[PDB]
Design a protein around this ligand. Structure first.
Ligand SMILES: *[C@@H]1O[C@H](CO)[C@@H](O)[C@H](O)[C@H]1NC(C)=O
Ligand SMILES: *[C@@H]1O[C@H](CO)[C@@H](O)[C@H](O)[C@H]1NC(C)=O
Ligand SMILES: *[C@@H]1O[C@H](CO)[C@@H](O)[C@H](O)[C@H]1NC(C)=O
Ligand SMILES: *[C@@H]1O[C@H](CO)[C@@H](O)[C@H](O)[C@H]1NC(C)=O
Ligand SMILES: *[C@@H]1O[C@H](CO)[C@@H](O)[C@H](O)[C@H]1NC(C)=O
Ligand SMILES: *[C@@H]1O[C@H](CO)[C@@H](O)[C@H](O)[C@H]1NC(C)=O
Ligand SMILES: *[C@@H]1O[C@H](CO)[C@@H](O)[C@H](O)[C@H]1NC(C)=O
Ligand SMILES: *[C@@H]1O[C@H](CO)[C@@H](O)[C@H](O)[C@H]1NC(C)=O
Ligand SMILES: *[C@@H]1O[C@H](CO)[C@@H](O)[C@H](O)[C@H]1NC(C)=O
Ligand SMILES: *[C@@H]1O[C@H](CO)[C@@H](O)[C@H](O)[C@H]1NC(C)=O
Ligand SMILES: *[C@@H]1O[C@H](CO)[C@@H](O)[C@H](O)[C@H]1NC(C)=O
Ligand SMILES: *[C@@H]1O[C@H](CO)[C@@H](O)[C@H](O)[C@H]1NC(C)=O
Ligand SMILES: *[C@@H]1O[C@H](CO)[C@@H](O)[C@H](O)[C@H]1NC(C)=O
Ligand SMILES: *[C@@H]1O[C@H](CO)[C@@H](O)[C@H](O)[C@H]1NC(C)=O
Lengths: 222, 49, 137, 198, 50, 149, 37
């Protein structure tokens, strides 16, 4: 088929005529960014030497190419460690999970790691980890950042975000009510704080419906 | 530049040219100054070999 | 470790900041009797904050502190002469060069592009504004 | 001091160069590691094989060197664009991005030259000495909810005050810095107190 | 030892059992003149910085 | 034969390491994009449209993933728009009156000031109305009663 | 063996002068040095 540039929307530049949205919707969407890649490394002797009897004569003449390539692969591995290090440890201040009670009507059981199990894996995190199907001198080095500590870093980031606001960046973790933080983040898009507080139940119901829809859509095995 | 880029037109900028400049026209030979004859007569005329 | 068995360093129940890795959430450093030490990952200092209904926090003071952030912006320019690399000080230099010198010509063009990129790195980080100003008293 | 990140560039460049000359030291399977020996005891129908072997080996070594230096220069380009971004709104303005341009609320950055690098003086606002206080979303006065025009509605014990979130400067509740919107029944958590007029 | 390149005078001292020298291999920088026993160096015909 | 086979294996290895190395460079580009989305979406608010969610970004919840990051980009999405009548300013007592915030918006005959992204009408009053200049320099002004508290 | 190091165009003195100009614009003019005069 031909390309779909988009749906045609007929709108008018007519001056002395304005439009204002009477009603608004809150919708959460997923953006997927692969941040790390599997570490790989090669052993020179098992690659170019193998089971050769003259392993010494093969090594001093041609193993230096493999030495450069292994140095490049080690640099790639260090780069892959630093990728997840700088995306997941911008702040190195680790937090307990707050007690899940009265989050302004926003029902955070799905995204926060429940204390029922001693892994820091969330329910959506469990679905993500279950749905992704994994898979002569080539050795796969394990990543420095284990899954448990990445889950703990995400838990600390979530706990700082929903409780302290954004002050956890500036080093004081000043606690904020989540309704106040939600109003202060509505204040950044030009809408006044009255819209959230006058309709807090509707906002909570919309976010819970979005959470349910994003749970059902991310559980259809495709 | 035209030779090192293999084209008759080059643009503005900087180009590191290959060394096609000088061709030597002289040859020098230096060996140790010993001119005795080697005993190939003893080796190639060995009566008892 | 999950990476493998480490022999030569002793584990510790405490937790210290990681500088060089091991590969399974473990790190090693030089720490005191002094020897090599191996420690688990420093998740960080543990901070206890209590999310509470209708409660707020406000700072009495604030502190102003400058910190060092270092970003390497440029790297040393290099160039390779083709004749002096592959020919060297050897005879038949013309015959050696017409068949295999264009590989080096491509690599030298790549290195010249790298050199131009390295000049442009410091040019665009240091001359975003090209209006020079004298030092005020 | 913590100048190792600048030293790593020079150290790895020196490693690339000395590893390259040690590559050129090899013989690559020919009968000799120098061109002058194999051009002094081999006729060209037999010499061109060893010439081809040595030239292909040296060109492969140069290919590996230019690959390493070239994508390393690409990574330096990435870091250079990051630093030029830090030139863009930390020197020529103010950055609202948290933790990108210093730990805390960024004020300025003083550029300083360095050998093949830029060293930053990221001066930042860092608050401390926190205190517990009691807040409410709004105040109902005369049957009307009152919202904060700026800052947070912050009460200690009895006196209700409004103050900004990043510093403790208490001002009395007054209609000039207080915004009113609707009645006080739809919103939960409202308290009630006297809102003063100037 | 056949080759093309300029020669100058060097000042380093060889061992009695050594007659050639290569500071870096595949360069062949060092050699002794047989006629005068003058220690010299072998450098390429021109510098590459053009 | 040893030289031929070793050079063949090393050529395969150098092709592999180039593919992996610049693939990891592209992965680092995506990682820097995600860390940028980790720097003002979860550590603050981004005013950049369409960068960090389809709509007006409110928050972002970082969720771990196998060799990646999946974001929870909650966004403001408005709808249900109605036509209205507007004019750049208001003229009263021979002086132009500009909006301190929002848009001067009228339906029928009554003129109101309201913010752009929500239909919350306020009556025209000098506290939320800014005055500058006379009535003739600007083009397209309607005139009405501006109230005082 | 043919490996030559090309010096950079922007020498240390002029980088220091550009840094001084940036500091002078920052602490005396503010941030208006970016746009305007
Ligand atoms: C736009 O404004 C002009 C006056 O500046 C007016 O003549 C014209 O009719 C207006 N356009 C519309 C769509 O009414
Ligand atoms: C606004 O939209 C919400 C979301 O569906 C709805 O529940 C509410 O009734 C709407 N309000 C009006 C006035 O249309
Ligand atoms: C909402 O949170 C409660 C815990 O307070 C939990 O029991 C419930 O299952 C959650 N809702 C959903 C849809 O998971
Ligand atoms: C070597 O032989 C040449 C040829 O006559 C002569 O000129 C030179 O002086 C000799 N050198 C020595 C050290 O005997
Ligand atoms: C070996 O002997 C023959 C006959 O006496 C003579 O012709 C020949 O020259 C000798 N070989 C050499 C190398 O002198
Ligand atoms: C360190 O941890 C191990 C783990 O059980 C424990 O047996 C040991 O007593 C600990 N050492 C100290 C000094 O507490
Ligand atoms: C805030 O800190 C400064 C600097 O140490 C100190 O002089 C001042 O007394 C502190 N303020 C209070 C209210 O304690
Ligand atoms: C009061 O402040 C302290 C600070 O250490 C904190 O631990 C405590 O939880 C706070 N109390 C309340 C009720 O928030
Ligand atoms: C509130 O705090 C101030 C200053 O910290 C103190 O003087 C005052 O007694 C406190 N209580 C009331 C009711 O103002
Ligand atoms: C805070 O929690 C208590 C639970 O004891 C509840 O009664 C109160 O209404 C809550 N306040 C809010 C949600 O503003
Ligand atoms: C304040 O609110 C409470 C509960 O809503 C009410 O009982 C009380 O009479 C109110 N006080 C005033 C002065 O309005
Ligand atoms: C009124 O709104 C509709 C929305 O579908 C639009 O198509 C129409 O052009 C608008 N009329 C005017 C005069 O702007
Ligand atoms: C404007 O709209 C409101 C409802 O949206 C309506 O009650 C009113 O009659 C309309 N006209 C005027 C002049 O306010
Ligand atoms: C409003 O403006 C029109 C045209 O500018 C004028 O005819 C009319 O008298 C004005 N009305 C008032 C009340 O000033």
């Amino acid at each position: 088929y031909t390309m779909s540039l988009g749906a045609e929307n007929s709108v008018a530049y007519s001056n002395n005529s304005i439009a204002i949205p009477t009603n608004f919707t809150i919708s959460v969407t997923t953006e997927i960014l692969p941040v790390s890649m599997t570490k790989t490394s090669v052993d020179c002797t098992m690659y170019i030497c193998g089971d050769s009897t003259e392993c010494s004569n093969l090594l001093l003449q041609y193993g230096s190419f493999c030495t450069q390539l292994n140095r490049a692969l080690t640099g790639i591995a260090v780069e892959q460690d630093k990728n997840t290090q700088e995306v997941f440890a911008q702040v190195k201040q680790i937090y307990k999970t707050p007690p899940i009670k009265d989050f302004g009507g926003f029902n955070f059981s799905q995204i926060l790691p429940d204390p029922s199990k001693p892994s820091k894996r969330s329910f959506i995190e469990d679905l993500l980890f279950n749905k992704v199907t994994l898979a002569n001198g080539l050795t796969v080095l394990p990543p420095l950042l284990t899954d448990e500590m990445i889950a703990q870093y995400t838990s600390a980031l979530l706990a700082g975000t929903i409780t302290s606001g954004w002050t956890f960046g500036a080093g004081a973790a000043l606690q904020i009510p989540f309704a106040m933080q939600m109003a202060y983040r509505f204040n950044g898009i030009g809408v006044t704080q009255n819209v959230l507080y006058e309709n807090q139940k509707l906002i909570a119901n919309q976010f819970n419906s979005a959470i349910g829809k994003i749970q059902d859509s991310l559980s259809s095995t495709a | 530049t035209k030779c090192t880029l293999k084209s008759f037109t080059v643009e503005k900028g900087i180009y590191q040219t290959s060394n096609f400049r000088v061709q030597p026209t002289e040859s020098i030979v230096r060996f140790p100054n010993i001119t005795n004859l080697c005993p190939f007569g003893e080796v190639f005329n060995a009566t008892r070999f | 470790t999950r990476a493998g068995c480490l022999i030569g360093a002793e584990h510790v129940n405490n937790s210290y900041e990681c500088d060089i890795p091991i590969g399974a959430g473990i790190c090693a450093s030089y720490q005191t009797s002094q020897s090599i030490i191996a420690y688990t990952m420093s998740l960080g200092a543990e901070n206890s904050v209590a999310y509470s209904n209708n409660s707020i926090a406000i700072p009495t003071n604030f502190t102003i502190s400058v910190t060092t952030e270092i970003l390497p912006v440029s790297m040393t320019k290099t160039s390779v002469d083709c004749t002096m690399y592959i020919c060297g000080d050897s005879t038949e230099c013309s015959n050696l060069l017409l068949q295999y010198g264009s590989f080096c010509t491509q690599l030298n063009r790549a290195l010249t592009g790298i050199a131009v990129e390295q000049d442009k790195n410091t040019q665009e980080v240091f001359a975003q504004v090209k209006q020079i100003y004298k030092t005020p008293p | 001091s913590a100048l190792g990140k600048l030293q790593d560039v020079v150290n790895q460049n020196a490693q690339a160069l000395n590893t390259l000359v040690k590559q050129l030291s090899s013989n690559f399977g020919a009968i000799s590691s120098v061109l002058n020996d194999i051009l002094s005891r081999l006729d060209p129908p037999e010499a061109e094989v060893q010439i081809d072997r040595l030239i292909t080996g040296r060109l492969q070594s140069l290919q590996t060197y230019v690959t390493q230096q070239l994508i390393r220069a690409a990574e330096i380009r990435a870091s250079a664009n990051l630093a030029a971004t830090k030139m863009s709104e930390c020197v020529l303005g103010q950055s609202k991005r948290v933790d990108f341009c210093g730990k805390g609320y960024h004020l300025m950055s003083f550029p300083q030259s360095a050998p093949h690098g830029v060293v930053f003086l990221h001066v930042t606002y860092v608050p401390a000495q926190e205190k517990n206080f009691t807040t409410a979303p709004a105040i109902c006065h005369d049957g009307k909810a009152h919202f904060p025009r700026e800052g947070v509605f912050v009460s200690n014990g009895t006196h209700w005050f409004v103050t900004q979130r990043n510093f403790y400067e208490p001002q009395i509740i007054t209609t000039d810095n207080t915004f009113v919107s609707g009645n006080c029944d739809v919103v939960i958590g409202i308290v009630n107190n006297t809102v003063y007029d100037p | 030892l056949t080759g093309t390149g300029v020669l100058t005078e060097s000042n380093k001292k060889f061992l009695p059992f050594q007659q050639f020298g290569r500071d870096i291999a595949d360069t062949t920088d060092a050699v002794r003149d047989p006629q005068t026993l003058e220690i010299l160096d072998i450098t390429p015909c021109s510098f590459g910085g053009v």
